[PDB]
Amino acid sequence: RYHESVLEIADIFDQADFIQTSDAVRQLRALMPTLSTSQIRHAIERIAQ
Amino acid sequence: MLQQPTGGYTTLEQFAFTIRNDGTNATPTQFLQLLSYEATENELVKKTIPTPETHLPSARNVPGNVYIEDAITQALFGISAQNVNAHGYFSRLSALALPNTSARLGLDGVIYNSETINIPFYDPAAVANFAATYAKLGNASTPRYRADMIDIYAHVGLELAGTDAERAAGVMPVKRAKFDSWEGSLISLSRDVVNWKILAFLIDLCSLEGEALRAFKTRNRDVFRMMLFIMSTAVAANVVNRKVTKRVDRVLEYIGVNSMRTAGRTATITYDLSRHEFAAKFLQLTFTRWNA
Amino acid sequence: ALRPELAFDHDHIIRCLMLAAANYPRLEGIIVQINTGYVASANVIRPVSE
């Protein structure tokens, strides 16, 4: 009996200077397949190309 | 002709001076509450202001209706004002200083050479008094008569930043002004100040005497302090933002120190050297009158 | 006088320089080449025949 949920770091910390993102990145990563390290390198080389 | 109220023209609601505070109308005094000052190591001692030259510019006749109010307010507060030292406007001003002149200063701030009955105008004795000093703005440029552009700002600091103890002392630490602020806070503040009819202010400063003038300096100290604020932003060596807890705080460094900056910038209005001469002369006369 | 360009971001540049130093072997040589060119352009020293 719980309720799992993302909790943004901004809601915990009071110092805005060290908070660049939001829940949305985690949600996007939740969309991604788990990547082997070579697949990560491939993605980076792709974006670069 | 509008007869002057015993307290001066500024008692009339027609001449109320106001500025938007992030877009909402407000008295200058409640804007000055927002300012706060981080003192630094340097000091500002106020030197005596040299007494202004007796010599008015010659009262040469000129074509057209000279717009003296817009000229002064632009040269002091407008974005890149031009030809601020052109002689003709102050030639007409000194024409207003003559004992029995036909020229009139309308509430519009325009100097009509006609006895034009249709437009209400300030009492001629009062504007004679006013031009009698402010025509001297006409020698802001002449080498003989240039006002100090550096030390005079010390006074500006005291009348703006200075605490009552510091003001009676005549010395204060050089200060860093700051306030919670919106985008274009300084520019928009200047845009509000530029629309001020400062002729009512200067005319009351030159025509009122004794208890009336003292009451005027007390009632209007915050107004004068706002104009001074706009000048200090025009000359502040650096102006920047400090984000703090999702609230930007504008910072101007430093109050009371003319940087002699001439090149334009986003943050604030800027004085070219001619504007520097003009403002410096303006302060010479206005502070000479303010401290009497 | 205003230059209508973005400020040199000192902090970001040193960070990205550090990351590049971590990950890009060629960085060293790149920087050297720049410096070499300076020396080459300063004409401070040339080989002689004898």
Distance CA B194, CA B16 (A): 13
DSSP characters for B196-229?
S-HHHHHHHHHH--HHHHHHHHHHTHHHHHHHHH
Mutate to test the interface with B, among C2, C3, C5 (most CBs of B within 10 A): C2
Distance CA B86, CA B275 (A): 11
Cα torsion C38, C42, C44, C45 to 10°: value is 60
Give residue B113's domain range. Answer: 1-292
Beta bridge partners of residue B28, listed in sequence order: none
Chain B residues whose beta carbon lies within 8 Å of the beta carbon of residue C2 = 263-266
Resolution (A): 3.1
Number of neighbours of residue B243 by Cβ within 10 angstroms = 10
Distance CA B126, CA B236 (A): 35
Chain A residues whose beta carbon lies within 8 Å of the beta carbon of residue B245 = 14, 16
Q: Chain C 2-21, CB below 8 Å of chain B: which residues?
A: 2
The approach used to solve this structure was cryo-EM
Report the number of distinct structural domains present in chain B: 1
Task: Determine contact, residues B272/B167, Cβ cutoff 8 Å.
Answer: no
User: What are the structure tokens assigned to B96, written together?
Assistant: 């207003």
What does the buried/exposed string (b/e) look like for A2-31 if buried means 16 or more CB atoms within 10 Å of the residue's CB? eeeeeeeeeeeeeeeeeeeeeeeeeeeeee
How far B247 CA lies from chain A's nearest CA (Å)? 11
| Host H or E run for residue B158 | helix B152-160
User: What are the structure tokens assigned to A15, written together?
Assistant: 């110092």
